[PDB]
């Protein structure tokens, strides 16, 4: 329910209390960097950069992480495609379809699953250009994900090349799976079994499995 | 297939070629520590410290790991007991018995199972005293276990407090199960299902499951 003020837009970052220990450095890092990322039209729009910090962490046990938001139409919620038009979320839905048995669905959202926090490593990109805002988010991205890894039990990063070394230089002993990106060659995400692997790993850490079918929209 | 020399007992170390990239550093690290180890009566006897290094690595997909050798009668082969007298191995055998359904047996050896390498983290202890040579093996143990984790896909560690922060310094993408010690109180190892979970993880990673009944001696 709290909010701190930055000096570049969105000027205000409203956050859940679970994010308090980090919010201080976020202001320092953001004010040093914002002017570069605000130069271009961004995905998402700046008023949506940080709306994911409204999500509690205490109840989360898995983090599903992609490298940066969609090249276009980023909503401020990682992976979200309201009208179910984006490939990655469509492919994620297909895997969960073949796992759970649900075939009749109109959409899928990772932001409505208990114990799961969808996350973008970088929080913005120049419109239509993936990873364009990497060097700008660099410090912030490390800062924020480290805080997430203090709460979650399993970190699931999508993209072998994307999360190549970043997961190792993250500096946490959190169980991590680096699976294929939904856009990978030779149907590698379709063969990918990470969602099944997550639930097995969670049982080892004495945590309840993720009900992946909860993301479905009818 | 080859052999290297050291300044202290056992003076000669025969190793499988899969260990080669690590043998150079082993000789160096051993030469600066051996005197601490050979000062006491050790389990196993110095001529048996490295006999597990004759085991190949490429064909191994599971590592079953204990903290150090048996307080007494250590053979150099981790977990092994010639006359089936040791508590750890008998409890391990009982666990495998209740899974596979095999009821009649005279012994059990983890060394004779395809795709499994039994491993003692520290390679010796002062006769009778568990974990007494921990700091002397530290550098070597980390070195060797990291080389092991570059081959196997699931690392199974037995002992909750023993492997607490030895998991925290993972520095490896390897799936790690830290299960109960066979000698744990209140029948915790009997209820422990890690042996089942290993094959489930192996099947998810697209690897041949472990046939555990190969360990039996009749």
Work out the count of structural domains of chain A: 1
Oligomeric state of the chains present here: homodimer
| Total count of strands of chain A | 10
**Elements of chain A, N to C (H/E):** EEHEEHEEEHEEHHE
Looking at CATH, the homologous superfamily of chain A is Uracil-DNA glycosylase-like domain
**What is the topology, as strand order, of the major beta sheet of chain A?**
6-4-8-9
Rg of chain A, Cα atoms, Å: 17 Å
Distance between the termini of chain A: 31 Å
**Net shape of chain A:** globular
- Tally the helices of chain A: 5
User: What is the CATH-assigned architecture of chain A?
Assistant: 3-Layer(aba) Sandwich
Biggest interface pair, counts: A-B, 12 and 15 residues
Structural class call of chain A reads alpha/beta
- Could you estimate the helical fraction of the residues of chain A in percent? 25-40%
PDB class: hydrolase
Keywords: DNA binding component, viral processivity factor, Hydrolase, Glycosidase, DNA repair
Assembly: dimeric
Entry title: Structures of Vaccinia Virus Uracil-DNA Glycosylase in New Crystal Forms
Can you describe this structure?
Chains A, B: This is Uracil-DNA glycosylase. Chains A, B: GO terms for molecular function: DNA binding; uracil DNA N-glycosylase activity. Chains A, B: It catalyses: Hydrolyzes single-stranded DNA or mismatched double-stranded DNA and polynucleotides, releasing free uracil. Chains A, B: Homodimer. Interacts with protein OPG148. Component of the Uracil-DNA glycosylase(UDG)-OPG148-polymerase complex; OPG148 and UDG form a heterodimeric processivity factor that associates with OPG71 to form the processive polymerase holoenzyme. Two copies of one chain form a homodimer. By secondary structure, the first copy, chain A, is α/β, with parallel strands linked by helices. The first copy, chain A, has one domain: Uracil-DNA Glycosylase, subunit E, CATH 3.40.470.10. In chain A, 29% of the residues lie in helices and 17% in strands. In chain A, the strands form four sheets. Chain A has a four-stranded parallel sheet with strand order 6-4-8-9, sandwiched between helices. The first copy, chain A, has a two-stranded antiparallel ribbon with strand order 1-2. In chain A, strand 1 and strand 2 form a beta hairpin. The longest helix of chain A is centred in the first third of the chain and has 18 residues. Chain A is globular. Chains A and B meet through strand 9 and helix 5 of A and strand 9 and helix 7 of B.
């Amino acid at each position: 329910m709290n909010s701190v003020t930055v000096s570049h837009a969105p000027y205000t970052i409203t956050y859940h209390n679970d994010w308090e220990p980090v919010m201080s450095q976020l202001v320092e890092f953001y004010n040093e960097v914002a002017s570069w990322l605000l130069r271009d039209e961004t995905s998402p729009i700046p008023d949506k950069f940080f709306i994911q910090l409204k999500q509690p962490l205490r109840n989360k046990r898995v983090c599903v992480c992609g490298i940066d938001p969609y090249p276009k139409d980023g909503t401020g919620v990682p992976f979200e495609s309201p009208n179910f038009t984006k490939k990655s979320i469509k492919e994620i839905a297909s895997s969960i379809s073949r796992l759970t048995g649900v075939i009749d669905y109109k959409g899928y959202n990772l932001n409505i699953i208990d114990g799961v926090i969808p996350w973008n490593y970088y929080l913005s990109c120049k419109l239509g250009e993936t990873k364009s805002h990497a060097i700008y988010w660099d410090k912030i991205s490390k800062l924020l994900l480290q805080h997430i890894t203090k709460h979650v039990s399993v970190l699931y990063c999508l993209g072998k090349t994307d999360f190549s070394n970043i997961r190792a230089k993250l500096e946490s002993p959190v169980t991590t799976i680096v699976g294929y990106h939904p856009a990978a060659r030779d149907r590698q995400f379709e063969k990918d079994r990470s969602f099944e692997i997550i639930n097995v790993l969670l049982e080892l850490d004495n945590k309840a499995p993720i009900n992946w079918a909860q993301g479905f929209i009818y």
